[PDB]
Write a protein that binds this ligand. Structure first.
Ligand SMILES: CC(=O)N[C@H]1[C@H]([C@@H](O)[C@@H](O)CNC(=O)c2ccc(-c3ccccc3)cc2)O[C@@](Cc2cn(C[C@H](O)Cn3c([N+](=O)[O-])cnc3C)nn2)(C(=O)O)C[C@@H]1O
Ligand SMILES: *[C@@H]1O[C@H](CO)[C@@H](O[C@@H]2O[C@H](CO)[C@@H](O[C@@H]3O[C@H](CO)[C@@H](O)[C@H](O)[C@@H]3O)[C@H](O)[C@H]2NC(C)=O)[C@H](O)[C@H]1NC(C)=O
Length: 307
């Protein structure tokens, strides 16, 4: 009994004040249409074996001459298209819509769910699983809404400030999926680790509607800071010098630590402190530590000993 076959999304989302555009097609194997009624939450009376409830559209009354001012409009034909449109949609419209249709001696009822919330629902940011420094990533912000009579826009904010990188916004309004996607590419620095990325929903005039925030987990090599005593780095032979190596940032945590004298690894220096108890003249160069993690080896600044 596959007499009727409808192609449309199973659920359409919107909010109070906006509009909703419902794509819909059908194929009636039993000729063209004779009547089309649009119920809101129809209740089937088991006694009379008919459908009751508030009728939002009747093809025999408010659809005999299309009014163009109608809030609820049927944009379809007699045997193919059942695209509905409520502009503006209200909270009292949220529910289950019924597409009661009749042809020659047979009739059919079709359900469409219309979820309308009082406030604009937030979008959603889809992050890559591993974000690493100097590697371009594509952040995806999706929104399960798109209507013609109410244009929207998605805005990317980093740390509460718009991002200079351009985005690409695309909308799909088909019988399969309805959404507004905005993708943004940018090469993250190590400092972006722990920073907040926001995707804001705004109308045509740019008024804030909703948003979704995330915190970046940017892998990076250990950024190091080196200290030396004395600060002036001046000494005589035999006297002591101490250098310290402090990991200021590393994602993930560090693994090994070694020291370098003009690019030469001093052996047995597996700690963050470099003690030169009795110095000479042949030393006196440029020192730096190397701390690594899963990401790789990170190097600190250079200090001129010069003795
Ligand atoms: C080709 C054909 O044969 N077409 C049938 C047609 C169904 O095939 C067709 O409409 C399929 N779609 C549904 O069924 C349907 C049901 C509910 C909803 C919906 C939508 C929005 C909100 C709430 C609901 C949308 C679709 O059905 C009838 C009557 C008919 C009467 N019943 C009673 C039966 O007990 C099951 N039932 C009960 N109940 O409590 O049992 C409560 N409501 C029902 C249907 N079951 N069919 C009709 O005239 O529409 C005859 C017609 O010739
Ligand atoms: C069922 O029939 C209706 C009526 O034609 C179809 O609706 C029409 O669809 C087109 C494209 O989908 C709409 O064009 C759009 O216009 C806006 C401006 O309002 C523009 O910004 C878009 O880029 C696009 O050009 C059109 O407005 C819309 N309505 C009417 C009255 O024409 C509907 O597509 C049909 N259903 C299916 C599943 O095809």
């Amino acid at each position: 009994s596959s007499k009727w076959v409808f192609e449309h999304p199973e659920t359409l989302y919107a909010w109070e004040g906006a509009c909703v555009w419902i794509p819909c097609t059908y194929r009636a194997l039993d000729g063209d249409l004779e009547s089309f009624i649009l119920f809101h939450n129809p209740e089937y009376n088991k006694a009379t074996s008919k459908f009751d409830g508030t009728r939002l559209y009747e093809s025999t009354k408010d659809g005999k001459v299309p009014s163009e001012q109608k809030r609820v409009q049927f944009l379809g034909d007699k045997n193919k298209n059942c695209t509905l449109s409520i502009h503006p949609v209200h909270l009292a419209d949220s529910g289950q819509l019924g597409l009661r249709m009749e042809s020659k001696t047979e009739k059919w009822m079709e359900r469409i769910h219309l979820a309308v919330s009082e406030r604009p629902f937030p979008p959603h940011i889809q992050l890559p699983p591993e974000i690493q420094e100097s590697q371009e990533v594509t952040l995806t912000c999706l929104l399960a809404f798109s209507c013609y009579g109410y244009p929207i826009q998605l805005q990317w904010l980093l740390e509460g400030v718009p991002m200079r990188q351009a985005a690409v916004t695309s909308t799909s309004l088909t019988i399969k999926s309805v959404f507004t996607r905005s993708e943004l590419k940018f090469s993250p620095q190590w400092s972006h680790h722990g920073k907040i990325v926001t995707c804001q929903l705004q109308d045509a005039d740019g008024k804030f509607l909703s948003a979704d925030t995330v915190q970046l987990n940017v892998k990076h090599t250990p950024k190091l800071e080196i200290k030396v005593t004395p600060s002036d780095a001046i000494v005589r032979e035999g006297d002591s010098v101490t250098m310290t190596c402090e990991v200021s940032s590393s994602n993930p945590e560090y693994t090994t630590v070694s020291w370098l004298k003009d690019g030469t690894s001093l052996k047995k220096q597996n700690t963050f402190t470099l003690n030169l108890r009795e110095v000479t003249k042949d030393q006196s160069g440029k020192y730096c530590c190397q701390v690594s993690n899963d990401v790789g080896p990170g190097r600190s600044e250079e200090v001129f000993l010069q003795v």
